[PDB]
């Protein structure tokens, strides 16, 4: 059900994405051990995901949310990155497979740092990096990331 | 895991690295549409 819209660099909505993945680029603690050492990101391709049985199941959940917080959704976008990107557009994002060993549990995590992100990408802490060469800062290799609307609802402040 | 009961996601806020931005986190991935997919590179530091 799946279909992807490749947006032109020329479009002002590239642009803001672009911007956000730019913009929100940090230095980490690691010194770039998981994710590379970068300051900034050459952007190939933005391709906006239409799958109306996945939207309409996130509508569904927005409203049941917003109508148990005051008409809030308290909707964002944040960014995703696991190696599980190609199957999150198809079927949608599943609990089943949630980040078990995360800082708050197992559950769907998402960053306001596309850099945090880019961590994940080639799977936890890098894993072995990109596949052809093994090496989480690779500067060849095509990476993806999810830009997301993410319904957050009534949050739980957690001080980490 | 479930939300914290009375809610519908966690925040990670950052209380040590001044410059880090939130985390989230969501318990049903109904939560979440994935708007934009992003192909790209790392590059090189000058
Ligand atoms: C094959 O899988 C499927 C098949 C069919 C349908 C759907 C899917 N998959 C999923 O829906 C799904 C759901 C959750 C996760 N994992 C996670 O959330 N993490 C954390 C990875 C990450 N951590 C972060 C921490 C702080 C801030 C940002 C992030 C971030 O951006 N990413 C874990 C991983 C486990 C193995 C490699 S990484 C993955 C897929
Ligand atoms: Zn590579």
């Known amino acids: 059900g799946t279909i992807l819209i490749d947006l032109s660099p020329d479009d002002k909505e590239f642009q ?4 956000e993945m730019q913009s929100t680029v940090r230095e980490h603690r690691d010194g770039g051990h998981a994710g590379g050492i970068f300051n900034r990101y050459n952007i190939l391709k ?3 995901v239409c799958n109306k049985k996945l939207w309409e199941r996130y509508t569904h959940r927005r409203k049941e949310v917003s109508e148990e917080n005051h008409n809030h959704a ?3 976008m944040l960014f995703h990155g696991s190696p599980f990107v190609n199957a999150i557009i198809h079927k949608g994002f599943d609990e089943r497979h949630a980040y078990i060993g995360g800082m708050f549990g197992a559950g769907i995590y ?3 740092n596309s850099s945090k992100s880019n961590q ?3 799977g936890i802490g890098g894993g072995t990096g990109c596949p052809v060469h093994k090496d989480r800062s690779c500067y ?3 990476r993806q990331l999810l830009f997301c609307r993410v319904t957050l609802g009534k949050s739980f402040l957690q001080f980490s | 895991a479930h939300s914290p009961p009375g809610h519908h996601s966690v925040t990670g806020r950052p209380s040590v690295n001044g410059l880090a931005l939130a985390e989230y986190v969501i318990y ?3 939560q979440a549409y994935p708007e934009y997919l992003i192909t790209y590179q790392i590059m090189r530091p000058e």
């Open chain 1, 74 to 76: 308290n909707e964002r």
């Open chain 1, 140 to 142: 060849i290799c095509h």
């Open chain 2, 28 to 30: 049903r991935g109904e």
């Open chain 1, 110 to 112: 998402f960053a306001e």
């Open chain 1, 16 to 19: 803001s994405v672009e911007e």
């Open chain 1, 120 to 122: 994940y990408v080639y």
């Open chain 1, 46 to 48: 933005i391709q906006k």
